[PDB]
Write a protein that binds this ligand. Sequence first.
Ligand SMILES: CC(C)CN(Cc1ccc(F)cc1)S(=O)(=O)c1ccc(NC2CCN(S(C)(=O)=O)CC2)nc1
Ligand SMILES: CC(C)CN(Cc1ccc(F)cc1)S(=O)(=O)c1ccc(NC2CCN(S(C)(=O)=O)CC2)nc1
Lengths: 248, 248, 8, 8
Amino acid sequence: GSAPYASLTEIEHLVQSVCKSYRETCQLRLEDLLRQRSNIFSREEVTGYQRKSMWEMWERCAHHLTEAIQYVVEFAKRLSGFMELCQNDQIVLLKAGAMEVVLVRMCRAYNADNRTVFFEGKYGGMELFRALGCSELISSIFDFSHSLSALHFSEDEIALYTALVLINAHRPGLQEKRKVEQLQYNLELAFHHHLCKTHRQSILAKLPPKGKLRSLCSQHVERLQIFQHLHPIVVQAAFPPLYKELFS
Amino acid sequence: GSAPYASLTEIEHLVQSVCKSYRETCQLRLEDLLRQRSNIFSREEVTGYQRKSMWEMWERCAHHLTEAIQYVVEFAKRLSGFMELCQNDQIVLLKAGAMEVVLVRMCRAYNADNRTVFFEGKYGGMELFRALGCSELISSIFDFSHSLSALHFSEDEIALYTALVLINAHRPGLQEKRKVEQLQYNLELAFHHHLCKTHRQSILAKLPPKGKLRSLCSQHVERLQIFQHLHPIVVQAAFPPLYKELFS
Amino acid sequence: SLLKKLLD
Amino acid sequence: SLLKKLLD
Ligand SMILES: CC(C)CN(Cc1ccc(F)cc1)S(=O)(=O)c1ccc(NC2CCN(S(C)(=O)=O)CC2)nc1
Ligand SMILES: CC(C)CN(Cc1ccc(F)cc1)S(=O)(=O)c1ccc(NC2CCN(S(C)(=O)=O)CC2)nc1
């Protein structure tokens, strides 16, 4: 969607393009996530997670975050008009936006019926994560997921919304800003056309406020920094290099 | 408005603005036109029109066209963004579009059930206009009106469509085409948003084809020139100067 | 022109 | 950077 004055046909085609790109990179099928809701951590397993060293739990979570980010990168690469951008801007957008997209995607793996999240093959509550030593953050992430589950997104809505989380012309450091603005605008037209057709424009007003996603990402970096000062060797020794690059 | 990257709010605002401009300049009340449908010229009244001289009939029709055109000029002046265009381009758009908009508005005064049009206080068929000596053009206008009537336009749809008939960035002679393109695109977005909301996007494929309004207008000018060569003094003495300006 | 006069 | 390498 880099071209100006996108026709209605082009906007309709962009909707389908974005949804296809999302479908092909959504990491886990929704069907599998929903099916596994009966797969929950036992009390002993929860106790076991709570018993884990801080370094082991952070290392696991860092790996899982990195995996989820790798799919967001592949999403961006397939996203209409993204690879047309210059390399600098591609990097600016992912560095700022990849974690934000992961946080939005995670609402799929959240079950409001028992307040659990899908983690390492089964569902567990926020008490699963006690060993991290960042309970306030974990609670904020659960709350955020709950607030998104309350919007009852379809998969197509997630595709279109996360495209716009990523293609944000306001990110500092863009070189070809006009090209990104044009791209953002066309994705906004696509999003809005789809919402119009499905009578869901009412959800725009209820989307995460300006700064909420940014705050969650900032807090992640802060808590990582706290961990890294407690355990300075493990991050360089065992964490995924992309994770260290994006967040350290 | 000619402003780039119109937001959803701005698009919604523009829908309301265009509709307001139209309502204030629509000439006759639709309810009046519809309730007068059962008022039809008698056989003797039609005969009276058919016995009128060619010059008197052209003179009446030129007066009625000019009256309609004057309401379209007022529509343009109220239409968002039009007065911000340079004057040369305002004139180019009205000189080319005023008659096109009148031809579209006229479908309001057309009864597809009995193929009659509102003319001087009652409804009559195309035989009312025989003394003009342009029976093929009259039949073509009746056909055009019938093709639009079949779409059963709402008044809001007429407002938005006629806005785009006027704001046509393809008119030869525009000096600042880029600004007309932007105003046209924003009005397209307004038109389409309204159609999507109201489940009426189906009418886009049924709208008059490329060239049809052009053809009717070119034939009007030609038939006028035919008449004028037969009756030069009548036009100078009795026809509205604006009419002569636009079509001679 | 008359359009000009009607427009300004 | 690693992001760069993943992109090309
Ligand atoms: C889910 C959060 C309460 C905890 N995590 C995220 C986290 C951890 C520490 C931190 F300082 C900041 C964020 S996590 O690392 O446990 C995690 C990471 C990825 C992940 N992905 C799974 C759920 C979502 N999907 S998806 C994209 O297919 O819906 C893939 C698998 N799940 C949990
Ligand atoms: C249906 C056409 C035959 C009506 N003629 C137009 C004409 C005449 C000669 C020509 F070479 C080309 C076009 S007309 O001049 O008789 C005419 C003009 C205006 C008019 N306007 C009325 C109907 C529409 N409305 S409206 C805008 O309120 O819906 C105003 C009154 N009606 C007929």
